[PDB]
Amino acid sequence: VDAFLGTWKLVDSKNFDDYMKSLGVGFATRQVASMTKPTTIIEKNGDILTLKTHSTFKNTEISFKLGVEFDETTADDRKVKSIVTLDGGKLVHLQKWDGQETTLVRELIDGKLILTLTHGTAVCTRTYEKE
Ligand SMILES: CCCCCCCCCCCCCCCCCC(=O)O
């Protein structure tokens, strides 16, 4: 887990609109989100990880242990059952609600953090650089 820790800033985004549309996010929220560049902070205290996502529009914070389910309320106000695991060196976050699922996968490639978001047929790639 240790290579993920730190402060990251968004530098590139592809197909986030498609992703948000698939989740049912309304057009006005999609407008603002398309212009927002969040900062993600990942910290550890023992076995507990904390993931903070900060922006001018909305802020979220979750704390969790790897491999243990937790309740999460997402930025778009879904109430989901989540689990985060390490798989092939990737941090894989699975959210389940109402029989649906979405995955948020983070991988480090060339020192950058690549976040891939999948729901239905929509696939979004967001690139973060370390601050
Ligand atoms: C918390 C602020 C991050 C982006 C805010 C705008 C988006 C809110 C509506 C869509 C939310 C979809 C789930 C969260 C996607 C996370 C993206 C990211 O960490 O880069």
Domain boundaries, the chain: 1-131
CATH top-level class of 1-131:
mainly beta
**Helical H runs in 9-127?**
16-23, 27-34
Say whether 110 sits in a helix, a strand or coil.
coil
What resolution in angstroms does the PDB record give? 1.4
Method used experimentally? X-ray
Q: Distance between CA atoms of 75 and 123, rounded to whole angstroms? A: 18
Q: 116: burial class by Cβ within 10 Å (0-12, 13-18, 19+)? A: middle
Query: What residues line ligand 1, using a CB cutoff of 6 Å?
Result: 20, 25, 29, 33, 36, 38, 40, 53, 55, 57-60, 74-76, 115, 126
From ligand 1's centre to the CA of 10, what distance in Å? 11
Task: Work out the number of other CB atoms within 10 angstroms of the CB of residue 54.
Answer: 15
